[PDB]
From a paper:
TGF-β signaling converges to a set of intracellular SMAD proteins that further transfers the signal to changes in transcription. Furthermore, there are direct modulators of TGF-β signaling and the most studied of these modulators are Ski and SnoN, which although sharing 37% sequence identity, have individual essential roles in embryo development and the differentiation of adult stem cells. Ski and SnoN have similar domain architectures featuring an unstructured N-terminal region with an R-SMAD binding site; a Dachshund-homology domain and a SMAD4-binding SAND domain; and, at their end, an extended, unstructured C-terminal tail2829. SnoN and Ski bind to promoter-bound SMAD transcription factors such as the R-SMAD/Co-SMAD heteromer, which in turn recruits co-repressors such as HDAC, NCoR1 or Sin3A to the promoter site.
Earlier studies have shown that the interaction between Ski and SMAD4 is critical for Ski’s disruption of the R-SMAD/SMAD4 complex. Therefore, to rationalize the SnoN complex-stabilization results described above at a molecular-mechanistic level, we crystallized a complex between the SAND domain of SnoN (T238-S356) and the MH2 domain of SMAD4 (I314-Q549). The complex crystallizes as trimers of SnoN-SMAD4 heterodimers, where SnoN interacts with SMAD4 in either an “open” or a “closed” binding mode. A striking structural feature is the strand complementation observed between SnoN β-strand β5 and the edge strand of the SMAD4 MH2 central β-sheet. When comparing the open and closed SnoN-binding modes, we find that all SnoN-SMAD4 interactions that are present in the open conformation are also present in the closed state. These interactions include parallel β-backbone hydrogen bonds between the conserved strand β5 and adjacent loop regions (residue Arg314-Trp318) in SnoN and the edge β-strand (residues 424–430) of SMAD4. The interactions also include binding of SnoN Trp318 in a hydrophobic cleft in SMAD4 lined by Leu414, Ile429, Ile435 and His427. To further strengthen the SnoN-SMAD4 heterodimer interface, His427 offers a side-chain hydrogen bond to Trp318, and Arg314 in SnoN forms an ionic interaction with Asp424 in SMAD4. Beyond these common consensus interactions, the closed state contains additional hydrogen bonds between SnoN (residues Lys313, Lys324 and His330) and SMAD4. In contrast, the open conformation of our SnoN-SMAD4 structure can be superposed on the SMAD3-SMAD4 heterotrimer without significant steric hindrance between SMAD3 and SnoN. In contrast, when overlaying the structures of the closed SnoN-SMAD4 state and SMAD3-SMAD4, we note significant overlap between SnoN and SMAD3. Thus, based on these structural, evolutionary and biochemical considerations, we suggest that the open SnoN-SMAD4 conformation represents the biologically and functionally more relevant binding mode.
Author numbering:
A (entry chain B): 259 to 354
B (entry chain A): 319 to 459, 491 to 541
Write the structure that this text describes.
Amino acid sequence: GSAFEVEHECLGKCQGLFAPQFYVQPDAPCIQCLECCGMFAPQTFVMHSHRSPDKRTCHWGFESAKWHCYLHVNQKYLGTPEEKKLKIILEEMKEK
Amino acid sequence: APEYWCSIAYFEMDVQVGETFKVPSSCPIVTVDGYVDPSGGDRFCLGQLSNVHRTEAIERARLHIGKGVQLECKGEGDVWVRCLSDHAVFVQSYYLDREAGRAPGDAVHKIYPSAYIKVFDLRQCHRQMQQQAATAQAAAAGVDDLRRLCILRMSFVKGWGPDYPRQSIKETPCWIEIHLHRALQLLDEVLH
Ligand code: NI
Ligand code: NI
């Protein structure tokens, strides 16, 4: 109802469900890996992937501290009613 | 010396879209983004460009270009990229191939949002240039290859890998090729 899906594409990829209710402290597990069902803080979610990099790709400039630049809404919500709404909520959650 | 310090060609898959953007030597920092001001000068916008053969997929991708990237020419002709966009960008750079210990052209370099990474060194390029030429000459007693030292290519949004659904950069929905002019003048002298 209130939780919405999110994703990141750092050192792999990972899709998750974000519940703004639980995001009560910087380190508060509010996101759950749709694969392993584990609950992660945003910064730790950005480090969590079940795929390993191609090692034909090289990754420059990554830092978990900058998770706010890397975390987006799930592509499911793209070209849909809900695209523009979820981004502001997400942006609001980045401010805190 | 050169009038423009680089020039930039935008493509959607294997079709060039728009005219080639030339960057004056007095604009050491050039922004390439997804917005629409057609001005010229220190900013090359891609939002406004038309393409009769555009697809749904290319349209989709163009939405993520957003603030795009800056390409900065530092001092003695070194080139840095800063990824202002909120999606990562992917780069072909022989320098990055070298820095990471990969064979030339045998890697793609993902640059992450907010990152500020150095993607070309003029002196190294010039050295590699002089040296390969002087040796191949004296062995007897890669023009198309040396050329590629003076050029970067970058894809906004999507990478291309073996390793990826798409194999080459001309299969990506929106990318750019960037010819660095001082490097090209130096190779011209070398070839004479
Ligand atoms: Ni992990
Ligand atoms: Ni795992």
